[model samples]
Target: IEEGKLVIWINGDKGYNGLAEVGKKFEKDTGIKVTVEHPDKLEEKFPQVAATGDGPDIIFWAHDRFGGYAQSGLLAEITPDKAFQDKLYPFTWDAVRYNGKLIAYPIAVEALSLIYNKDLLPNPPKTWEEIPALDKELKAKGKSALMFNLQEPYFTWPLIAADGGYAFKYENGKYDIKDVGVDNAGAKAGLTFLVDLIKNKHMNADTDYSIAEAAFNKGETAMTINGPWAWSNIDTSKVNYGVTVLPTFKGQPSKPFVGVLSAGINAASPNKELAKEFLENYLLTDEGLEAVNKDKPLGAVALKSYEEELAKDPRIAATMENAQKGEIMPNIPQMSAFWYAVRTAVINAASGRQTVDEALKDAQTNAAAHMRGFIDYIKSSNEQRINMLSEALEEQYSHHGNWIFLQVVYQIMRSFEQNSDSSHNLPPKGWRTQFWVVDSQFNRLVGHSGPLPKEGPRHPIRYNNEIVGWVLTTPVERLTRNTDINFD
Candidate 1:
């Protein structure tokens, strides 16, 4: 065992050879020899190795694929490891908790950002309204103002999520895609806006992402959504660029699906303890950052302040503020249907193949048919609660637009009246209100009030089949939180 060789499996192209280069440096720095094996389809290999008890000591991949492999006994539950059980970002740490155990090693976290060529279009559109203005300007100039990939599922998320659409639901505390989020009105509106972009010729249909990449790099168009991964393929020196928060529909910020690349030890490995020791050193120190972040311009995981040094880079600073709104992509397996239905619905809506409403309706109908079966599959797997709350929260918020959030004045007023807390004694402006109700319970809301105030129960409430919560009084609008009702 003293001179034993440690083997590892890496996903395709070795994360674009980011780690292969690092392995050489690591071996040079330390006397230990590490062999990294990368196949074109290592995801296929991960389950194979773990299944046959021949998996590498360490594996590198994104958490998005967690639902499938973890269920197959292809991934080890890290809950058994002591060190990770103690230290890790609680936000990033959430992904590690799979199947009642910490499953993956924590590494770099990145969000989709609006990376644009500022020199060509100095001022980017901040809202949907401004996009038309930009389009008009581009038209006058006889040049384009957009770059995109119609084929990829994620390329349009900013536009869809900005309009407040999501792809899944959270039933029973986990992300559920059976009902799907595209059916919601806000998603329809979001898709409509993108369709407008296509009609205006802001984006070119024939140009795939590779061509779009050249468009930005060659300074043909102004902006598009992308992540650090693009840095490796695109040239920066030819263009003066900056990253910004993805433009939103009104003023509401869009949520980016933050993807993480991390390491996890094979549960089947005889060297599980050594595997833990290696991963514990990963991305935690400057040492690991040097290993992973050097060749590629990928951002640091920076969990627990590992990314502090990133602040010095202009690109990271301008881009990182938006990263705060970065939402973790749910790892639940329902994601397959979610990705297909929502993204396909988006392309159809954007391209005018169907109206946004019709497209989303198709998606929701398709998703609803499969979700019960998806849940049944989850219950059979080891992870029951994994990503469930996120699943539900995304579904509720994704269904409505900013207008629904504004409706909270009426909602809390009802809550107050229902609880008789309404003398305006304590309004729902408090954190507990937002965090508990707006954030949690509101997501669990079943239906709109039955009948406002005829003769029945003043204000009727319903849950499941009957009302679970209710309120009777109209909101006495505060002069401060002004609405139609003016309260002195």
Candidate 2:
């Protein structure tokens, strides 16, 4: 009856009911009132909510977002009771710590690894050098050697790591943010390799997570690089999958960033001591941790003893081994800007719109611009600037690059066009005068008509299996300013 009320705000979509059960038990045991709230839009809501001092005692979230919360003074320094220090994995501590102070309780680590179809790739390549030959071999049998979400920066980040590129280098026991390494020599080597992969047609720039997952699970692709979160999404019945560390490049290992799931006490909370007791006593125990794992397994708990028990499952063991190979994800507030800047470069380079160097330069420039201030609206001057850049890239690089950026450009242009709507001259609105039905098999016009109805009853021209072709049509001849099919 001593420690006061404890409240927790669990991130929506994470399995929080288990924690709620633990909360109830803690209430019965310690006689403290425990409240568990599952809320949406935590990313947007938490900063504002927590700043107001009505924030929950504990909050669960990814360690990647920790830096911003900690820097904003929304998170409390939470040192687990002494005996618990020996219980957690060393790497997991890096994720929960900011400026060497423990800010949260580590839950599990997520690191991307090479997930291969065991039956198809019996011996997966141990290095990038082997991929070309393997791709050729697999394609001959009407299957792809590998596929991953090429559009996402997280998936392609290993390429950067392989060559010793880092967002912020850890120096003298501290992460120095002044050292931005995205456009470094190592980054160029990595991004250049990815560009070469696309040039050689080994991978497509359009592939996303769904496309890769579908292809891999359907047996169309033999391998992919993804994290343990994908384990539940994969169709196990169709895929005998295996997880291993990403291959080496130029004799250097491909390192994926390790992200941790964690629970932190709110700096604004009144019941800090009670919250500490709940996390250190009830939630970290085998019973509470298992309950967290029951709904959906979080790969490996940071605790060695708990991890050892989970490792009994070979898959869990493989994941843990893979995680051990990765560098802990940077817990800096700047990482928010880092994602957009680096991702744009990857997207641009992969799509063939820019050489690796040009894309990286633009990325660095854009990051600086973003940091300066908010660009709330795009005016006509901004349009001209964007267009000039587009034209320069087209003139220099000249090809069909990834349409992701172009699509955004198109939307912006369309919005501007809508704001400045105008009409073109048309010949009195009775323009269309001809229609033709072409035979699919014969590849010839089987039927033709003139002055056809604008909206006819779903016409079906009969043939062996026909009435399908690029059915050409013509409008009434009109004279205009020297052009093909000109309207005046």
Candidate 3:
């Protein structure tokens, strides 16, 4: 450990000022120097430098990347005892965990919500269905009812996940990458709603972060879907705005992705113990949190005791309340595939290049291919087990009408593989899989799999030296269903 000095890296002027204040206090009390550095591209540089054991003793960043760092052995795990754990919000604990191990300490949290111009939109729509009429009303006055980044997945996720869709199936503290839900019916409905808004002239397909921000700031747009961080970019003097939870979609609550900002100790640092001490005993304390909040005013405080004090600010109260209804952002590394896929899907659908169904199908396939390396497939050598498992899955499929249920079957199969012995035969069935079988016209023939599913790179099914159909393979089973045709 470097004896009298500790180094830390952070981004943002507010964050640097707040932490620098805490650092000065620490130096005064402990006689140890605390250096807070604001480095450009901290996200890109941290991982590379940390790998060589040359990064800061403590790094402050979002919790979403904790999984990748912890998995790579770049982060030191700290077990927050029961008393300390009880002091923070429950979701903060979830954000800092990767594979069930605590890898960081949560400092603050945030989520997307409805930010509206109070002067124009005195009564924000309670549901998305109300927007079209509001847009019509605003159009006569040369304004729009709402605007947001139409192509950014982060801003659009509440719409995509409004009904029954999800980026990944999360259960028992782990996300199942193989059971992606971006192409499901609910997701398609949500995306379709957004596309229809463009087709109806309610909003433009080209509106993105900068465009939306500019419009909202100029009072050309009455409302926007944004986070508390947006306050920095918004012109409060001109706009008179109020923050609230996002309106419902199809009668279902819109749940945005919640992100937690956290501080982690570098595993490679010799001052690991000292770093933890600074975080748990100093940064996370009531005095430290208050100092940081006084300077930056976090979107939401993770410390439960401090939250009540911060809630005095209506913006903070609104964001913190909306966050309770939101889903935590997935921390897995494969989430990168999801962001790319979903953004492509949204743009394709919005731009008229493809139908919503087609765009989502392609999105799912692309993301699945990216995540294929993480999926475990039965070896060709285990022919008998595969056959038995196939039968069991087929039976289960017949009993359930939803894809979510089938995903549960996949989860069960994974558990079986982990816990069952070779001597054990597959249990008598109740599970299913969706297989894509398309005719020459690219029309789907069987199952709920989308039209032209897995089209780009696929396995072909043949008979009599003629290609009949394509086979759709999943992590657990190979699905082959064919139809015979008589040539005219």
Candidate 4:
């Protein structure tokens, strides 16, 4: 807690070097000692250490995890004045907010865009309809039209979301985790389009990021769906490429997931005022941005002041424009489930193990279960106090308060049950227990028993008469109510 010193933790070498350069100018302009450290596993280490009050004054990380960090009281709330807020992209602010409070300052923004080989495809397709013919034309010449990480939801999202698919519904500055849309009609159509490409041999089902990148680099593929962070590798491979917004699908523009890299002050740090000053007056300024850009190239600057300068590179300009058309990646901790479920679905469909409908439907179901697990974890901690305060709080706050209270209670009870021994525990005889739920790809979602058994009676877990998962135990009849369970 030195009066004139500020400490920061950053993860990457390039990012650390960039911030270290910015720190030098801050130190010279103001009589403050700036210490920057490149730490290993900052994601895992920061929250654990910060809770104990021995963490650095500032932390640089992506906005996705900041929501959980802010919820856990690790970050100081950042109330940037309107004037300062006006200097950055308005949407970038969305990534830094948790429960309507700004928890971090956005440094850069990123999203997937169509990157094409200029020599092979003079112009990229404007719509997905044009891809099939282009694929035929390219294949005749021993090349593929497009390839990306097919098994990755992050890379496939623009397509799945083009026709209104979404992982969660966001409204009024909050995300409704229960309103998952991964299996909706729009999502089905989008995924069907992808599977059609594999069926016609337009793209490989097995293509992953590295395989796709290598193919594009070696001129075997004409284009890829990627973000600016990948440009360095593409550039190193000496490919003449161009970046643009993703092609339209079903007459709708593709909406990739937007991510923001941000900086925040540790709530436990004693140097809050100085840390805020360093962020607002030093690190967030055009000069500070320039130093970092010169050292490591942000590719897409969050500040309007630095964007024009960076946009001189056409690749960066295209990426920035694509970002404007993208949706902010949901920052809730529940997103972990969305990633796992959706990725499993994508891999399952692409590998021909399941139809698009089967994969996405299973994804929606599994994601909801996993999200409920997260809610249950939070509810378990506050249940006793909430139960005691429920009536009084409901009387004070009325319908809205009662609704919130009941929602919390419902989530906890659904995920746990009272045993005969009087201990609250997950039920032992249903989808949550009997089934080792997984997609066709075998990505486990809710396995209770030890690793997949070597021998068992495989039973199907069905949705609309189609099997989505396998279980070892006899399938239980569907129950109409949670209280229907009979210990006998």
Off by over 4 Å in 3: 3-5, 12-14, 39-41, 49-55, 63-66, 269-273, 294-297, 330-338, 373-488
TM-score for each candidate, following the candidate numbering: 0.64, 0.70, 0.69, 0.74
What shift in Å separates residue 275 of candidate 2 from its native position after superposition? 2.0
For candidate 1, write residues 1-488 as lDDT tens digits.
12244567766533435566556655665556767777666776666556464567777776443344454455566643454444545566655545345667667666777777777777777776677677767767665777777666677666666656766544433444434676676776666777777777676645567877877787777886777677655564568777766787767676666666777777677666656555565435666666556655546464555566676775565445555565555444345775787767776776678887788888778766666565444333212121222233333344562224433443544543556433322321110111112212233242334333232212223333543333222222111121111112
Positional deviation of 467 in candidate 2, in angstroms?
Answer: 90
After the best TM-score superposition of candidate 4, give how far the Cα of residue 95 lies from its true spot, in angstroms: 1.3
**Per-residue lDDT over 1-488 for candidate 2, one digit per residue giving the tens place of the 0 to 100 score:** 12378878877677688778888999999888898887887756777788565677788886543355664557789877667887887767766776567888888777788889999988888988789779988899899998999887788878776787776566644544445567888888888888887789888888888899889988899898888778766656568888776888877878777777788888878788888889988988888888878865778788787888998876677667666767665433344676799888899898888889999888767765553332211123333433333333232223333222322333443454455463322111112223333333434332343432344222332333434323333322211111112211
Best first by TM-score, ranked: 4, 2, 3, 1
lDDT of each: 0.57, 0.68, 0.72, 0.73
**Model 4 TM-score, 2 decimals:** 0.74
Error of 3 at 81 (Å): 2.1
Which has the better lDDT: candidate 1, or candidate 3? 3
TM-score of candidate 3 versus the correct structure, residues matched by position: 0.69
Q: What is candidate 4's lDDT per residue for 213-259, written digit by digit as tens?
A: 88998989999988877788778877899998789999888888777
Error in Å for residue 295 of model 4 = 2.8
Decide which is better by lDDT, 1 or 2. Answer: 2
Clashing residue pairs, backbone N/CA/C < 3 A, model 4: none
Better of 2 and 4 by lDDT: 4
Clashing residue pairs, backbone N/CA/C < 3 A, model 2:
none
Candidate 1: what lDDT? Answer: 0.57
